[PDB]
Amino acid sequence: VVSYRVPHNAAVQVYDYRAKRARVVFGPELVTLDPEEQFTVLSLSAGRPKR
Amino acid sequence: CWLIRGPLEYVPSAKVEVVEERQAIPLDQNEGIYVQDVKTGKVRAVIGSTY
Numbered sequence: 001v002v003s004y005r006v007p008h009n010a011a012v013q014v015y016d017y018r019a020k021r022a023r024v025v026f027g028p029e030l031v032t033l034d035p036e037e038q039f040t041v042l043s044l045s046a047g048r049p050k051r
Numbered sequence: 052c053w054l055i056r057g058p059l060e061y062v063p064s065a066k067v068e069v070v071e072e073r074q075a076i077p078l079d080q081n082e083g084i085y086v087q088d089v090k091t092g093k094v095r096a097v098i099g100s101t102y
Contacts, residue, residue, distance in 0.1 A: 035079070
């Protein structure tokens with residue numbers, strides 16, 4: 001299983017492509033991806049000034 | 052050419068002859084195999100259950 005341990009004040013958005021349904025869980029939950037569930041990888045800005 | 056499939060045992064009679072083994076392909080929903088029905092050409096792209 002692929003399971004991500006979500007931080008407390010954080011949200012992870014997934015979709016079950018096998019089931020045609022959308023769900024996003026905020027808060028400190030342990031997501032459990034179905035065999036065709038995929039994550040919302042977020043490219044975020046960082047660096048000293050910004051990137 | 053006819054495909055015998057299922058929970059049975061076969062003994063090839065003198066008339067008939069084996070061609071190939073035809074192992075099944077596992078497919079879940081939102082996934083399939085592009086199948087060209089060479090008897091009628093029509094490619095069906097059967098998805099869902101295993102085919």
